[PDB]
Amino acid sequence: AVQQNRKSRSRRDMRRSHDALTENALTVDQATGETHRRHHVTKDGFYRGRQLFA
Amino acid sequence: MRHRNSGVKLGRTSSHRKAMFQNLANSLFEHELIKTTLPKAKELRRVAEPLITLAKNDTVANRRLAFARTRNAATVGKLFTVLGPRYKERNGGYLRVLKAGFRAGDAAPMAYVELVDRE
Amino acid sequence: MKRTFQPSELKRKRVHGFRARMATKAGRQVLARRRAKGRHSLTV
Amino acid sequence: ARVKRGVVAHRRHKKILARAKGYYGARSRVYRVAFQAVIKAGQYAYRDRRQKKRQFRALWIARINAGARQNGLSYSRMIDGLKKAQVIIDRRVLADIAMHDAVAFAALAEKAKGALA
Amino acid sequence: MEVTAKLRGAAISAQKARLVADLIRGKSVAHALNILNFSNKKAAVLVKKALESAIANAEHNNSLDVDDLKVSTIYVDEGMSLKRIMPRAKGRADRITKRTCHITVKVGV
RNA sequence: GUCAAGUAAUUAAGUGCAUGUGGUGGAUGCCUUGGCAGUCAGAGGCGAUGAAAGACGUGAUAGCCUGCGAAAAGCUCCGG
RNA sequence: GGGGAGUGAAAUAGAUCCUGAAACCGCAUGCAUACAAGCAGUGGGAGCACCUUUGUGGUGUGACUGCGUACCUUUUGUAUA
RNA sequence: CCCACUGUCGUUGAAAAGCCAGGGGAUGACUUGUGGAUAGGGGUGAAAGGCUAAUCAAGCCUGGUGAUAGCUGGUUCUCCC
RNA sequence: CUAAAACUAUGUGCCGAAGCUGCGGAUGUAUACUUUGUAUACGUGGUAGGGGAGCGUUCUGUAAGCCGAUGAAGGUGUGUUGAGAAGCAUGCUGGAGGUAUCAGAAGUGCGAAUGCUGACGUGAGUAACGACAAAACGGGUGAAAAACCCGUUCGCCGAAAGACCAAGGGUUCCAGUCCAACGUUAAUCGGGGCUGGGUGAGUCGACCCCUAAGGCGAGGCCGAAAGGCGUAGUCGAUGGGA
Ligand SMILES: [Mg+2]
Ligand SMILES: [Mg+2]
Ligand SMILES: [Mg+2]
Ligand SMILES: [Mg+2]
Ligand SMILES: [Mg+2]
Ligand SMILES: [Mg+2]
Ligand SMILES: [Mg+2]
Ligand SMILES: [Mg+2]
Ligand SMILES: [Mg+2]
Ligand SMILES: [Mg+2]
Ligand SMILES: [Mg+2]
Ligand SMILES: [Mg+2]
Ligand SMILES: [Mg+2]
Ligand SMILES: [Mg+2]
Ligand SMILES: [Mg+2]
Ligand SMILES: [Mg+2]
Ligand SMILES: [Mg+2]
Ligand SMILES: [Mg+2]
Ligand SMILES: [Mg+2]
Ligand SMILES: [Mg+2]
Ligand SMILES: [Mg+2]
Ligand SMILES: [Mg+2]
Ligand SMILES: [Mg+2]
Ligand SMILES: [Mg+2]
Ligand SMILES: [Mg+2]
Ligand SMILES: [Mg+2]
Ligand SMILES: [Mg+2]
Ligand SMILES: [Mg+2]
Ligand SMILES: [Mg+2]
Ligand SMILES: [Mg+2]
Ligand SMILES: [Mg+2]
Ligand SMILES: [Mg+2]
Ligand SMILES: [Mg+2]
Ligand SMILES: [Mg+2]
Ligand SMILES: [Mg+2]
Ligand SMILES: [Mg+2]
Ligand SMILES: [Mg+2]
Ligand SMILES: [Mg+2]
Ligand SMILES: [Mg+2]
Ligand SMILES: [Mg+2]
Structure with missing residues (x-):
């Protein structure tokens, strides 16, 4: 129940x-130069x- | 065990789950683009796409089935006048689900669900 | 559960009030003691 | 005359904790544990001042035994023969010679051999 | 020459901020800002505030270009705790500590 | 050069020790605005002409404290 | 909240403000540490690093190795579970 | 509404005595509000030594009082005989 | 381990302790002897306990002295001296006191008392986040929106989870504004902070008139004193009176 x-x-x-934590998978989008999370909008x-939403 | 089982739970009773997916499908048919959690978005395919497949043919029996599964007369009208005719020669795949980061207050992963040839 | 306090202001003033303390020798000794201590409230 | 025991007590604790540098964990940080560690280190060092002489003599004797067995003897007979030959070199010097100078040690073994005969 | 920024009194315990501090130690400030932008950690927001403050200090007060700056030092220390009471069952009471921390960031060329 | 046999160096997820540099915390030192014990000398009461103790009020602007009492941080006279 | 600028003799005297110890918690550097069993030291002892020197020098570390069951109290007697 | 028979759960509880499922009484020797009375070797008790402010084989507070304890515990720098 | 690494008997060596000896150093007692320094001898494991000698801390005198902004105390390192308690010097920090010597007085030395107060660890970033009536989406605002607002749906209560009083509370009511702390998360929201506002009675209630239980009680009776009971009266709603 408790330490001795x-x-x-x-x-x-x-x-x-x-x-320890890990970094995420980030990619540079080519159609905007932007950096985003891979497979994410x-x-x-x-x-x-x-x-989306022009 | 869970071998080969389909379906989700999402921490709700089956009544709440059925109601919530009814609400989600109505919302999506009305706005054509919504933001929800990613598992909800992935289960919404199995709920919302058979409605469009149903709305492809316009019979009184089909409209009544659509009403029994949506309980929203405006949703039924939109399914059978706009969404049905639109996806007439598309063989499935009326929804598009795209991962959209995380919710702030929750860190829950998010996703956009949109209709394919919208806007 | 029902707890022991159960407030009532009339009963408080009739048991522990100033005029109730002033009405007997022992209560006036209570008042003298609390003045000797320098209490800011003499009674309830 | 009220006496505050702050400076002197702090000085004593600092002395004990300075004698504990290098010990593991609480034994170098916490005065109650460090103080026992320091007293025990002292007892150990007292006992090991005695044990060191035994240890080094046993080392010299092993090295002399190796050197004497390289020369057809054993430690027992070589020490006996060197004591019968009036040689009074002690074991520390004999072990140093055996380790560093094999020819002189062979000469000493020859003295011991000739005395044993 | 290192340029410093100190976020003192951040409302988070040091043990949790240190997980984020360990992630960006010894990295470019562009890479560190990327890492902090896409983290779901509450400490990432505070460490990003401190790190972008250090970059602004380096540019304005020291005239250093940002393209080669690097997170040359970072560490999280404990701050002043807040002491609170938490009622427990059966009339027992517990003491809750609301732990704060100080973040120090030093960027270097 | 290849093969075989034998045998070194090379990792630190983390950790220990030492040093350096920090945080936390508020000890120590120095200090005193407050206390403690006396000596000498006084005094030893206040109150129905309303006491001790209070409540409420009183300010160009005040919360509390202090003073004061609808004449209310005060009025008159005398002296400095 | 901080970095500059400025004030000040002083700002790690900046209001949680004289001094600013310990426990306790970081970061940096050197050395050790992933085939090895226990009061964590002690005696010896290789190697490495840094200072210095022409040292049989100093400072840190400590592979390997002999010995080694805390302190107090109370007891006839305690590593005592 | 008053109560508390059984069981599970809870037992650092949602709770210093509960919840939930069941249970008993429910026009009476009933339940209950407001106000009053009885005070510590005393009160009150369809009586269990029950209750008398989460305290009851003699309440609490203050004082005697630093009660007494042939009993536990503790008792602080150094060296020499 | 077997013509032993067993047993019996005998021998020659050797190892082996903090015992003995060697070398160096200290000290107690005694004896000589300078007349207090050396020799000589014997001694120097210790609990309870007895005896002897010292260190250091605060304060008083010495001291209207001596040291100190060319840097005191304190703090933190280093080097060094002594058998010890300890001392001394010095780098950094610190910013105003410190104190020889010899006397004197003690709140004079802490590791333990399930000691006391404060700080901070371990457990551990673990259990838990308080009724299993339930949410979803769009828009707004905002640094940030699962929780706020607006809207569209869904669900729950409906002899209470709605409404009104008494009691109790005491401004929590309403509006503007802010988010540190408080809210078991975030919060732009709030019963949180700051600023302002708001409670209108002949008929409602209280006060008022009247009395119950009970209380107080002029006189009075009783009692060491304090006081106890009680008449006349006077209060006292939970009841009566526009
Ligand atoms: Mg399947
Ligand atoms: Mg869940
Ligand atoms: Mg159902
Ligand atoms: Mg690592
Ligand atoms: Mg570490
Ligand atoms: Mg102080
Ligand atoms: Mg300083
Ligand atoms: Mg300071
Ligand atoms: Mg290895
Ligand atoms: Mg016993
Ligand atoms: Mg026994
Ligand atoms: Mg034993
Ligand atoms: Mg034990
Ligand atoms: Mg054990
Ligand atoms: Mg029931
Ligand atoms: Mg019945
Ligand atoms: Mg009694
Ligand atoms: Mg009686
Ligand atoms: Mg009985
Ligand atoms: Mg009794
Ligand atoms: Mg006592
Ligand atoms: Mg020996
Ligand atoms: Mg001896
Ligand atoms: Mg000698
Ligand atoms: Mg002896
Ligand atoms: Mg002795
Ligand atoms: Mg003392
Ligand atoms: Mg203790
Ligand atoms: Mg968690
Ligand atoms: Mg665990
Ligand atoms: Mg678990
Ligand atoms: Mg859990
Ligand atoms: Mg909840
Ligand atoms: Mg409101
Ligand atoms: Mg909050
Ligand atoms: Mg408010
Ligand atoms: Mg009477
Ligand atoms: Mg009378
Ligand atoms: Mg009346
Ligand atoms: Mg009434």
């Missing part, structure tokens, strides 16, 4: 050794040479 000894700072860091509404 306080965990040392070294073991705590060794547990967090798997906590841009915030301007562009995706693969197609426009």
